[PDB]
A paper describes a structure:
Cys-loop receptors are a class of pentameric ligand-gated ion channels that are activated by specific neurotransmitters, including acetylcholine (ACh), serotonin (5-HT), glycine (Gly), and γ-aminobutyric acid (GABA).
Similarly, we found that the affinity of d-TC for Ac-AChBP (Ki = 509.2±38.0 nM) is in the same range as the reported values for binding of d-TC at muscle nAChR and the mouse 5-HT3R. Remarkably, at least three different binding orientations of d-TC can be distinguished (indicated with binding mode 1–3). Binding mode 1 (yellow) occurs at most binding sites, but with ligand occupancies that vary between 30% and 60%. d-TC molecules were not built in binding sites if the electron density indicated partial occupancy. In binding mode 1, the tertiary amine group of d-TC forms a hydrogen bond with the carbonyl oxygen of W145 and forms cation-π interactions with conserved aromatic residues of the binding pocket. A second ligand orientation (mode 2, magenta) occurs only once in the pentamer and is characterized by a polar interaction between the quaternary amine group of d-TC and the carbonyl oxygen of W145. A superposition of the (+) face in binding mode 1 (protein shown in yellow) and the (+) face in binding mode 2 (protein and ligand shown in magenta) shows that the different ligand orientation in mode 2 results in an outward displacement of the tip of loop C by a distance of 4.5 Å relative to mode 1. Finally, difference electron density at one of the binding sites involved in a crystal contact between neighboring C loops indicates the occupancy by a single ligand likely adopting multiple binding orientations. Consequently, these different ligand binding modes result in varying conformations of loop C and stabilize the homopentameric AChBP in a structurally asymmetric state.
Author numbering:
A (entry chain D), B (entry chain E), C (entry chain A), D (entry chain B), E (entry chain C): 1 to 205
Write the structure that this text describes.
């Protein structure tokens, strides 16, 4: 534990925290979703509740170290509060997202960070037709709240949502689930905006 | 990165925080709304729930810098906790407002700040007649809680609520949505009080 | 800005915070209610929900200053957390009160403080008869939780609750609303206790 | 206020906080309940909600002073965060307890502390028979979560629950309410455990 | 009080907090569940709510002392905030866990820690058949959120859940409850992953 304490002190206590990305030093965040359950549909307010894991990854020069200088530590776990993290947010939630897991990240000696919060999210969806063979389609966009594509770029590893852990006995079965990078341009500004579109088709039985 | 780190230290770590405006140093806050959805109407209690983005802009001389002195940085993002923010509040909410987005501001080198919190708001409105073709009109005033017009002035860029992001499968159809600056006068004191009246006429799908 | 920052620095950063009143240096807190809406009535549990502004005023010697020494500043606004506040409490709530407004107060150069929190309160009341013409009466007492009348006295400026802001389209119509200072003797204790009794008579409109 | 400021500084800003009791230096906490209302009875989940004031009293040598040294001050009010407090817990709650009063205590010159949190508690009870002339009996135990009776001894001043403030128009009549110190033997541990059994008999209307 | 104050200062105020385990300095956490009550069952969302006490035990060399040096103190109670605690998490919750007990742990002179948070948990569970003689079986896995079996190994003293405290009058009767260590291996990586599977069979009473 002596070496890890030294490393953390060197990384965190010995310099001002990373002030986030800028156009001159942009960063790429990879997003991936693991859908666990569709827990609730409300057809009187058009709200649907999902439970999922959101995998985020990024890399910072300021979090790099040489394992040989620290007893060959190649990675460590630490509170998310200890590091900068991206402001990735649902764009059409209807209630504050509910965090279901400890806020702890894994940092690797190449400066890469992996952070996987589990969340319950209520978002806007008209669920009518959910009780049919065809099912229904809902969508919610995820992206930075304040950084344009010039500061934060988003990427997915695959366009397919991970369904391997979807609750087998859910009230709702998943027909398809995709996660797709998009580039928007608002008629006010020249910079691109990026989001990842979570599109889920599902039905009752 | 080095220059941004130095700039924030100069802006935030060297002086005390802006103590807010006064009659001698008044401020103008620009407000605007982007209505995403009407998520609930409760006819038993006369409450209606909105989800919206709330644009706020103002400008502080104490947040100014010369880009040439800081590696040509022209603006930056920072936690809204790092800066003074106006106490803009709904005048007829029935529940604490729920914040749906990160609290992060954009600061520009001219001292301008832009802050766009997304919110779920419950407020007083009698929805009677919402299920007619003529619909129903509700209204909520927004303004400073403790500053009069001598200290904080309000403006809208436009009197038209931004509806271009309105949920396309909402239970409710928006007939009109305006945001209008108003000068109030309580028969207690001379100084004027300013508010922005959000007025929304809508009906069931 | 400079003068104000200097004033606050002098009032808040140079001496320990005011530790609250004692018998030898008692304080008077003036209370007043602006009733905005009766939002909910629950006959299953005998709970009624009110939304109101609670106006509080008191005066501290330690908050005085000479405007001439501070650029003619005669008053200022500041976070409620910067100052001592009375522990004024509803005595028969059934849920934690919910705060609907920013916790900011106005401080004046003679040491007077004005604080007006907006709140939603659930309290004990049997609504039986609310649907009639006579309506129903409910009452709730407000006062310090831990200070006796030897340390904090209360008073009202008028025993008439301010209804000039009551929601015109409430489900309930106010027939009467009074706020009355009471002096209580508790058999446990030789000190006088003071409360303000908010009595509201109302019916379905 | 000068004298009170000195006293708090001497009591609080000189030594570490009291680290809580040990077998070598045990502490006795006195508990007393004032039942204000049985708010809710859920027959579908067997949950009952009470509102009560839980009076806690204990005494510490480290909180003692001589009034002659501090301007005849014999007691003072202070934030509960300023002092050690016992971890008295309801043992079969089903939701986190909700605090309804300010977290402030009264400290007296003999080192005695009195802290009276008003709370709303949901707990496990089968309300079958509540709608009979005989009513139903429910019980809830209170005591330290982590201290044995070797470290914290509990007592009541009376076995009779204070019903003098019970809400006159509750949906429920109280047939009886008692609070009884129990010495408990757990087979895990040779040390005695102590709890206070709150037993309430009640019926509809 | 003096000796304990010394001990806490020596354990907590001299060195940095334990930074958590690593592959070189792994840690075993022992878990044991005491099931108090199955409180809710929702067949429209497939969620079930449990109240239980989760015993957690582990041992750090950095928490050891010689009782002879500290007045024979053999163990002490302290806020869970003063120490490192393992990130043990339910893998299929549908809402943030609710904490029902004080966050206070017991530390023993051999460096061992015992911490027993009482909690209400909502987790994914199809209750179909709960209203039958055979009842239904649900399960939820517990483990570290970010540590693999190389860093945190889990174990149970027994595979039988503690039922000695189950609410006698619950709406649901417990047919069986087991808690068993399991070793997973996720396709991506080679390190073992460890969880404790809590399996409850139950029926309406
Ligand atoms: C639904 O569409 C939007 C999606 C998103 C945003 C904003 C969107 O559209 C809006 C954009 C604006 C207000 C309200 C909006 O609803 C701000 C916009 C604007 C101004 C100055 C700028 O600086 C010079 C600037 O860049 C601006 O444009 C953006 C500001 C923030 C964001 C995007 C664009 C991120 C912002 N956030 C949550 C991410 C997703 C002044 C006023 N003006 C309205 C023109
Ligand atoms: C690791 O598990 C426990 C941890 C702790 C305790 C008890 C625990 O589990 C037990 C709980 C019980 C017996 C044996 C136990 O081993 C009592 C339990 C019970 C009854 C009545 C209650 O009131 C009407 C009640 O609240 C009960 O549950 C608790 C009682 C005390 C404590 C917790 C729960 C605190 C008690 N102690 C000091 C703190 C930590 C009667 C029937 N029943 C046996 C089911």
């Amino acid at each position: 534990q002596a070496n890890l304490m030294r490393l953390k002190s060197d990384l965190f206590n010995r310099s001002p925290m990373y002030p986030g990305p800028t156009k001159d030093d942009p960063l790429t965040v990879t997003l991936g979703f693991t859908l666990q359950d569709i827990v609730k549909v409300d057809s009187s307010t058009n709200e649907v509740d999902l439970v999922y894991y959101e995998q985020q990854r990024w890399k910072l020069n300021s979090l790099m170290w040489d394992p040989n200088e620290y007893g060959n530590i190649t990675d460590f776990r630490t509170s998310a509060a200890d590091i900068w993290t991206p402001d990735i947010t649902a764009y059409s939630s209807t209630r504050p997202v509910q965090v279901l897991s400890p806020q702890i990240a894994v940092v690797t000696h190449d400066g890469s960070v992996m952070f996987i919060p589990a969340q319950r999210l209520s978002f806007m969806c008209d669920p009518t037709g959910v009780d049919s063979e065809e099912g229904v389609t809902c969508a919610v966009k995820f992206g930075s709240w304040v950084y344009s594509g010039f500061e934060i770029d988003l990427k997915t590893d695959t366009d397919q949502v991970d369904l391997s852990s979807y609750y087998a006995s859910s009230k709702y079965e998943i027909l398809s689930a995709t996660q797709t990078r998009q580039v928007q341009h608002y008629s006010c500004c020249p910079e691109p905006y990026i989001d990842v579109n979570l599109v889920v088709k599902f039905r009752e039985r």
